[PDB]
């Protein structure tokens, strides 16, 4: 149904909430009965239509000319740190980061687990071969950016169904969480200078 503002525009008249409510109530009474032709037109005046769109946008794959092989290139961004991950569809399990091996670039076990997440999800763990370039921020931020980029580059080689799973696993959604600016007259953006009653 129209908003209150749209009926206000249609009649060139200020309205009250109660009034709007009364009317819409009446249009429900109208829809409640057998619907004639002019009846339907009438209620169509007060009808509007709204869009809804949900799909993770699917990149068509890209077959490289050199080996004749297909790859997909993802970009994740988390918290001062961006990563790009090219995933090759036929792998040895090789995963290279900034030109060095992923074990050496993430000596923190936790990070390697984060990395393992999408691949262990899609059971592809050995199947794929990834090249990686990441910059900005500290280690966990980096491992997470690679998580996002990878899980993004992994939806070319996955089935249309597993995509909604990765969404509900929350893999492809960015982390909105970031540092909050200190505020002046305070300490930590939240933390305040110790307050004195006396």
């Amino acid at each position: 149904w129209l908003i209150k503002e749209e009926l206000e525009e249609m009649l060139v008249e200020k309205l009250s909430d109660q009034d709007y409510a009364q009317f819409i109530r009446l249009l429900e009474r109208l829809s409640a009965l057998p619907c004639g032709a002019t009846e339907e037109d009438f209620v169509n005046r007060f009808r509007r239509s709204i869009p809804x769109x949900x799909x993770x946008x699917x990149x068509x794959x890209x077959x490289x000319x050199x080996x004749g092989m297909a790859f997909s290139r993802g970009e994740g961004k988390r918290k001062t740190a961006k990563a790009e991950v090219v995933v090759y569809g036929q792998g040895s399990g090789r995963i290279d980061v900034n030109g060095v091996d992923y074990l050496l670039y993430f000596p923190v076990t936790q990070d390697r687990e984060q990395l393992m997440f999408p691949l262990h999800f899609l059971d592809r763990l050995g199947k794929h071969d990834m090249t990686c370039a990441v910059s900005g921020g500290g280690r966990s931020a980096q491992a997470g950016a690679v998580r996002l980029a990878m899980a993004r580059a992994l939806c070319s080689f996955v089935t249309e169904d597993e995509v909604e799973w990765m969404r509900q696993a929350g893999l492809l959604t960015a982390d909105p969480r970031v540092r909050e600016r200190k505020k002046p007259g305070q300490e930590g953006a939240r933390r305040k200078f110790t307050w004195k009653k006396r």
Partner: protein, 86 residues
């Protein structure tokens, strides 16, 4: 004390449920006004301070009676309304 015992204020529990039978006896005493009287009679209450109680009670009973009636009279018209959005 001169009366035969166990005839007065006696419930006998049926099918062995005690709590139910106690609720029952309680409903007896409270229906007859004995609980309000025990509680009243823990301490004294002076004659004046008693007519005040009486009168406040009886006013309040009148009000609630009337208001009840009025409510149950207007009850019909609680029905969902015919003329809406005239």
């Amino acid at each position: 004390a001169n009366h035969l015992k166990f005839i007065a204020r006696t419930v006998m529990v049926q099918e062995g449920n005690v709590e139910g039978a106690y609720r029952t006896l309680n409903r007896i005493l409270t229906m007859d006004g004995l609980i309000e009287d025990i509680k009243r009679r823990r301490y004294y209450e002076k004659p004046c301070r008693r007519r005040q109680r009486e009168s406040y009670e009886t006013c309040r009973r009148i009000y609630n009676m009337e208001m009840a009636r009025k409510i149950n009279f207007l009850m019909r018209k609680n029905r969902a309304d015919p003329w809406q959005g005239c």
